[PDB]
Amino acid sequence: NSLYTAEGVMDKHSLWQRYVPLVRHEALRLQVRLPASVELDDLLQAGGIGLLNAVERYDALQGTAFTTYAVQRIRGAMLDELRSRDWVPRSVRRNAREVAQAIGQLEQELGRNATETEVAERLGIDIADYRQMLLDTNNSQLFSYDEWREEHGDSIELVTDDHQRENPLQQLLDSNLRQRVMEAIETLPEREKLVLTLYYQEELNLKEIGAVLEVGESRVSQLHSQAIKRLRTKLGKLL
Amino acid sequence: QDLVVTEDDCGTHEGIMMTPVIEGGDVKEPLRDRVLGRVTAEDVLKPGTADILVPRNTLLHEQWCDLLEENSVDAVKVRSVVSCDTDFGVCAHCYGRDLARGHIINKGEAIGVIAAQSIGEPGTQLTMSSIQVKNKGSIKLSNVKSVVNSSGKLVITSRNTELKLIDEFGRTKESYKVPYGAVLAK
Amino acid sequence: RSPGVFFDSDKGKTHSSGKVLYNARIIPYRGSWLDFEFDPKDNLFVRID
């Protein structure tokens, strides 16, 4: 690209070009981790763009190196894109790195493992703190179609369970009971049949009628109760 | 997948001759079997000549195979499947009988289905000098060019020819082909 | 199979030839394999892994 100035573009871009190898080699140990670590090309694109941003705003009177002004934005960009891929918060991972340091450090202190009260004391915050963190951090993503072990008898897509299923007779008898509500209340005062119909039938408004009559719904309460007492006059399981 | 019967008869023109598979030794498929449930290509006759029994087509059941096995025919044509001309399908006449049923196939059936199953099922099971007449009978050599050799006997001057033993009646007993200019005793 | 060395010859690979092709193989316990072999026209060739 370019600027309004031209020699401040060609010097700009010559510098840009010259320390692409820096982008490389500093990246070239930020390897084995998450599979874009395998890619490395994302890294290069990112590095170039962060470079331009640093470049745009080099501060020269400070007398720092421009490589040293660069490294800041370089790293920050790299970390940004990794932070983009992960979808879990940050202080999470602070705590995770911290337990890692501490637990290794103190397992060296002791020379053996797994005496969690040591975690409690060393991280003198609370037990429930790390106890919850253990959930929060250490439990990660898995995939759906992986084979079920002793070659390909079935997958994980066979062995699945659900709770929100359909069931045919509950809606059936629900409608039976709806018409039984009608069967009870068609004999009863003009409004209450209607309030309970149009509230329970087509899923409309209740006190919308309390505003229409303007009786305070004392009588509404009473008649609601009596209709209950009348539909404790039938027998139906699904209890 | 595609194949069915479309039509009752296609009224189509002729097809193939069945003639027996006796070669090497004795019969290995009766001509009767190769008639059973065929349809004739044509009106067909008897060695006492001019005795028709199909008006171009019949169900060729064992009455007829017997009626023929009385006599000495050795070749008959059939409205083969291949000469059936029906566009997108076939006629039943060209097919004839459903074996498992035992009568003329009705219209409406699938075929190559049956073919594929019938052929695939067993196949699993299924990997698992001189010429010297034995018996008397007339000799029949066809499409020959040959010569009396200097000794006086016959030697073939066209690779076409092959020896037969025909019985005294006229049906073949045996058939064995003889090399070009091979030495004969007869 | 062991590590070490191994000899063999395929028989009419380009079956137009119907010709033998001898070749040798090397298999370290750890590290890279290696293959020496001939061609239809009696010339040596090599390939790693």
Partner: protein, 119 residues
């Protein structure tokens, strides 16, 4: 007879000179064209043979071809060409799950076919 549903062309005047094509369709055109339609503009023919595995794909329908083997290639060479299958095989009906063009449902199938004729 299922191995043989194609023949290559000798002459021309109806279509391309030697383009591979149904024998049956050749018979149709000449059962239509070489008739009093015309003495001859249409063409004569060699006769072809084809092994089964590539005969099977080499078909009007793409679907049955697309079912089992090299479906993608089929799919392209059809979809480029604005092709369309007409629901006449078995598989064509079982996949959509309609009644078979045969057997018991033969009769309703011919009913639906005269409906295809009758609107």
């Amino acid at each position: 007879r299922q191995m043989l549903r194609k023949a290559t062309i000798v002459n021309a005047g109806s279509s391309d000179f030697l383009e591979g094509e149904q024998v049956e369709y050749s018979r149709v055109k000449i059962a239509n064209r070489e008739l009093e339609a015309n003495g001859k503009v249409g063409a004569t023919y060699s006769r072809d043979l084809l092994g089964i595995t590539k005969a099977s794909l080499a078909t009007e329908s793409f679907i049955s071809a697309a079912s089992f083997q090299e479906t993608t290639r089929v799919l392209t060479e059809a979809a480029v060409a604005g092709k369309r299958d007409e629901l006449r095989g078995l598989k064509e009906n079982v996949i959509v799950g309609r009644l078979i063009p045969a057997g018991t449902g033969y009769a309703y199938h011919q009913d639906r076919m005269r409906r295809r004729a009758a609107g």
